[PDB]
Design an enzyme around this catalytic site. Structure first.
Site, PDB file in Angstrom:
ATOM      1  N   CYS A 156       2.227  19.436  28.623  1.00 54.53           N
ATOM      2  CA  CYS A 156       2.061  18.774  27.347  1.00 54.53           C
ATOM      3  C   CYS A 156       3.007  19.395  26.313  1.00 54.53           C
ATOM      4  O   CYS A 156       3.638  20.437  26.556  1.00 54.53           O
ATOM      5  CB  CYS A 156       0.604  18.919  26.855  1.00 54.53           C
ATOM      6  SG  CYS A 156       0.278  20.600  26.306  1.00 54.53           S
ATOM      7  N   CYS A 187      -0.813  24.116  29.170  1.00 50.99           N
ATOM      8  CA  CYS A 187       0.030  22.898  29.327  1.00 50.99           C
ATOM      9  C   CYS A 187       1.292  22.916  28.490  1.00 50.99           C
ATOM     10  O   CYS A 187       2.240  22.255  28.846  1.00 50.99           O
ATOM     11  CB  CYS A 187      -0.782  21.590  29.024  1.00 50.99           C
ATOM     12  SG  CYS A 187      -1.358  21.341  27.315  1.00 50.99           S
TER      13      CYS A 187
END
Ligand SMILES: Nc1nc(O[C@@H]2O[C@H](COP(=O)(O)O)[C@@H](O)[C@H]2O)c2ncn([C@@H]3O[C@H](COP(=O)(O)OP(=O)(O)OP(=O)(O)O)[C@@H](O)[C@H]3O)c2n1
Length: 252
Positions: A157, A75
């Site tokens: 992320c 991520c």
């Protein structure tokens, strides 16, 4: 035939064979996708648009394919891009520092391909497919990319990077997939920063394109989502790639 139903290029020749072959290659190379049944993938892809009016495609049409193409992506290593896909791809190819959408099974399957079907026949349309502007936006190709790009953006992320084309009149373009879909689907709970790399196209010495009004717009949008924004100029993309391949090595 001297005329065609739609304004866009028709389905890529040997589309079924191409998608199938890409799926086989991908799942052969990428261990985590090693069980994937490429026939089922092809059937699900087909299912999204065959026998359907190519101006009446929805995200739901692609859900069987999305399910089959479910894949974990690191991520914190996502690279988004707008317009300049070649550099983005050449970059991630060096040592997999990052992952673009086209490094996922689904992005790999569809990259550079066009496809559409016909209402109430099961035929692929090799003659023309809807143009996003002139014909309709809810076409099989546009809807596919919107759907997969939303999912990819939601998986990001930490620090997310984006390469933007500094030689274009709109470095950040709110109408692009990046600007209309990805920026709005980054999850502020997870994403700390969006860092833009503004790729120069103008040779040698140039402006600080991080000051470009469209970059300031992007900063404002991202900041207002409670995500930090960072921007860096890449003045010589050729030098950049060289430094990636051979870091600390030269004049880097
Ligand atoms: N490989 C790839 N990845 C896509 O998506 C993510 O989308 C971003 C790149 O798209 P962006 O340049 O639109 O921001 C990246 O961050 C990826 O993560 C695409 N999103 C859209 N496309 C397709 O790229 C092709 C050319 O689109 P264009 O943006 O150059 O021109 P277009 O907007 O279609 O012109 P129009 O006729 O006025 O609609 C079309 O097949 C279009 O559907 C895509 N192709």
């Amino acid at each position: 035939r001297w005329r065609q139903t739609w304004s866009g290029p028709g389905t890529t020749k040997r589309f079924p064979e191409t998608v199938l072959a890409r799926c086989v290659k991908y799942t052969e190379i990428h261990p985590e996708m090693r069980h994937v049944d490429c026939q089922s993938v092809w059937d699900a892809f087909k299912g999204a648009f065959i026998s359907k009016h190519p101006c009446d495609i929805t995200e739901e049409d692609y859900q069987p394919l999305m399910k089959l193409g479910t894949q974990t992506v690191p991520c914190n290593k996502i690279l988004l891009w707008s317009r300049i896909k070649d550099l983005a791809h050449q970059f991630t190819q060096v040592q997999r520092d990052m992952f673009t959408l086209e490094d996922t099974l689904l992005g790999y399957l569809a990259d550079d391909l066009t496809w559409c079907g016909e209402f109430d026949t099961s035929k692929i349309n090799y003659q023309s497919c809807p143009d996003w502007r002139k014909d309709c936006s809810n076409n099989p190709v546009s809807v596919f990319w919107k759907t997969v790009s939303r999912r990819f953006a939601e998986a990001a992320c930490d620090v997310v990077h984006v390469m933007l084309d500094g030689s274009r009149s709109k470095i950040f373009d709110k109408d692009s997939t990046f600007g209309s879909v990805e920026v709005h689907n980054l999850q502020p709970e997870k994403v700390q920063t969006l860092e833009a790399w503004v790729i120069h196209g103008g040779r040698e010495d140039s402006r600080d394109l991080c000051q470009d009004p469209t970059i300031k717009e992007l900063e404002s949008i991202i900041s207002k989502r409670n995500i930090q924004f960072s921007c860096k100029n890449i003045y010589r993309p050729d030098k950049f790639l060289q430094c990636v391949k051979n870091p600390e090595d030269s004049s880097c």
